[PDB]
Ligand binder design. Structure first.
Ligand SMILES: *CCC(=O)Nc1ccc2c(O)cccc2c1
Ligand SMILES: *CCC(=O)Nc1ccc2c(O)cccc2c1
Ligand SMILES: N[C@@H](Cc1c[nH]c[nH+]1)C(=O)O
Ligand SMILES: N[C@@H](Cc1c[nH]c[nH+]1)C(=O)O
Lengths: 414, 414
């Protein structure tokens, strides 16, 4: 016997499971179309150098990499954003801006699952918070389309610029700001003692550490304004963001949370993440603005960007908990049934007619009795059974039976 | 500057190219639905042992493999059929038969492209030639749906059972039959001298070699019948196959060709391949019956199977040659244009309304003048521009302009 289990940490999607995945992806595609985003894709295999950021990111640490026979260092992508930037950079100033690009790549890791699909949505060339507004509204729209409400989920929002100021003002070199965000990102998950210890190892003293902890636990935007003024660029941007989301009609879906930083080095501005309001699951999605990445890739001119990723695993757990993923059985419009094998040529002509009319149709393929053919029709979820028998055929007719029998002229079948 | 080119032999699909790929995939999906096939998928990463067939197959020789950090021997799949069989085997006798499964996996090789997408269609649990009939009709239907006709393309058909008999009758052990098919598969591509030399290296003498060459060049089914009788199972099956395809209405698309064997070890019966009738391209698609594979994987009971693969590269070259892949520019229903920034909140409310009605819509995101917003609307392929200005808004109206302006009440927009 060959090994029937898939490779470690990887999923099979036989038809039943594939229908569930399609239910999800259909929503990602449909939301992207609704919001005017354009699809793209890139190879699952990228150069490892693409991901060397040196900020202690979990994503870059857990990289599924290997060496080709040719000696080239490659990885199965841990995320899509670097691939997106490569594409954008490759287009040069022929790229028309603003650009709104989406994809649903399988991404990988090695440490538990080693693969997941991740809906990616990115707006490129837009400096203002309107980009983040649209992105967050798109994530809410996807969740609403799956049957969830603002009672089930929300999106927590913050800006890294608040922390940027505190870190700069405390005398810390800005090369440590990204590593700091990575550490601070672990705040909720591990003990405060341990997070402070990690900040200590970076070469930051207790005073600096205190200033960071205090700002992360500020519970409102007015309180941020007290620490940094009402006209600190982050205050205006957040307020603008909330005003715009409210005008769009998703005000009940979003809220401020000063503890949201995200785990990736490249975010520079607004950051956000989706969560379930029962506090049972990990983040549903996550993103933010990353205005410097393209500059760090060698873009001659800075290109503002913002986007998010939205994984396939947590959302499904949530939807299952809420009873929003019932199995949808397979369906087919018609099952054509030869009365016997001598009727097969005629039944094939009928099959052609039905498909020509845009219907989905099967024909009984092997030899079986009429009753078993009706049972098969039921099992495959046929709406209609079309029996092709000698006597009806002589009359220019077939027998039609709605499954969820009467003689009908061929032409009236469709 | 980071490297903008993708990894060697791999394609990027920015929006323009992705639209072309979607045009193709939409056809594969739509054909599969028309023919009652169900989608599945499996991991791109499979155990290398899955592909060790030892028949000198090009497909297994050019395997993109590597070793995980954990020491496990894996490959990026060279083809899908072994993954399909693994899935089928895993289901046991809970799998309901007949099963008709399809997928569009990216498959890989290492030697020129190193990746391609390949539409796979397989019928499982069907012993009779009706399976091959449906599969071939499905491939013709996909090609017709892309704009091709039986004047452009055909499908060449044969059965390996003819050759099986000749090889058996000549005293050759049946363990050499598969390696022989692999060699004979190269007949058209390399010199007859070289093919005979390869057969010689396997330990077959000139007499045996002659018997094979003669049968491959027989130009009709009557001639096959002379070599092996009219009632040799292969004769009845082929005739049944052609009668059924003719009754379905695709008789002009298909023909007999005794030189078609295919390059894979596992085919046991009918084999086929698509070709362009100008003789300019490689095979468009290829498949056949493989009734023993599941037995060789350790299935306790034999499971008949048949299917094909249909790559994304050759078909596109053909469609390009025929002028059947014009660029389809991006479109969007509405572009909502704030008259100025003070109108942004109202324009967002309008944007929500439009999307709520099922329309695809953008809003101008950054700050720009109305004329530039109309230019952007034109560039993104907007059908309609919706201008949100103060004076119309006071009247409960917006301005609508069909792009391929008049005041309209909000409610009448949709
Ligand atoms: C539901 C559990 C979860 O989401 N799993 C998960 C998270 C992140 C991943 C990355 O980044 C890569 C591959 C697979 C996963 C899986
Ligand atoms: C159009 C050229 C062609 O079809 N290229 C091609 C053939 C076969 C492949 C396999 O089997 C794996 C990966 C990539 C290709 C590409
Ligand atoms: N790549 C990020 C999500 C993202 C997309 N665009 C910007 N951010 C992640 O994996 O979490
Ligand atoms: N796997 C075959 C095609 C096929 C699918 N099913 C049966 N045959 C190929 O790569 O050519």
């Amino acid at each position: 016997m060959v090994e029937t289990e898939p490779v470690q940490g990887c999923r099979d999607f036989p038809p039943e499971a594939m229908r569930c995945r399609r239910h999800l992806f259909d929503v990602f595609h449909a939301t992207a179309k609704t919001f005017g985003f354009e699809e793209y894709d890139a190879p699952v295999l990228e150069s490892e150098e693409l991901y060397i950021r040196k900020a202690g990111e979990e994503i870059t640490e857990q990289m599924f990499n290997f060496i080709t026979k040719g000696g080239h260092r490659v990885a199965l992508r841990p995320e899509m954003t670097p691939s997106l930037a490569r594409l954008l950079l490759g287009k040069g100033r022929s790229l028309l801006l603003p650009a709104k690009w989406y994809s649903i790549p399988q991404c990988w890791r090695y440490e538990r699952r080693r693969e997941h699909y991740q809906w990616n949505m990115d707006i490129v060339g837009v400096k203002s918070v309107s980009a983040e507004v649209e992105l967050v509204c798109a994530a809410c729209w996807a969740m609403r389309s799956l049957g969830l409400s603002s009672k089930d989920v929300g999106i927590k929002v913050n800006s890294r610029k608040v922390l940027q100021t505190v870190v700069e003002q405390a005398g810390v070199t800005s090369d440590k700001f990204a590593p700091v965000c990575v550490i601070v990102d672990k705040m909720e998950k591990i003990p405060r003692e341990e997070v402070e210890a990690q900040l200590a190892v970076l070469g930051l003293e207790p005073t600096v550490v205190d200033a960071i902890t205090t700002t992360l636990s500020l519970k409102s935007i007015d309180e941020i304004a007290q620490r940094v003024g009402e006209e600190h660029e982050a205050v205006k941007e957040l307020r603008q963001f909330f005003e715009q989301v409210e005008a769009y009609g998703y005000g009940d879906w979003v809220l401020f949370d000063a503890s949201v930083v995200r785990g990736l080095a490249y975010y520079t501005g607004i950051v956000f993440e989706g969560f379930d309001r029962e506090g049972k699951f990990r983040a549903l999605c996550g993103g933010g603005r990353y205005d410097n990445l393209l500059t760090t890739y060698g873009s001659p001119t800075p290109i503002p960007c913002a986007g998010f990723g939205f994984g396939d695993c947590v959302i499904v757990e949530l939807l299952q908990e809420k009873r929003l993923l019932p199995d949808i059985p397979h369906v087919v419009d018609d099952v054509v049934i030869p009365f016997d094998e001598s009727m097969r040529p005629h039944a094939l002509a009928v099959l052609r007619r039905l498909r020509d009319a845009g219907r989905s149709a099967d024909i009984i393929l092997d030899k079986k009795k009429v009753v078993q053919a009706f049972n098969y029709a039921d099992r495959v979820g046929a709406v209609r059974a079309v029996l092709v028998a000698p006597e009806e055929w002589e009359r220019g007719e077939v027998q039609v039976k709605m499954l969820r029998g009467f003689a009908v002229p061929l032409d009236r079948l469709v």
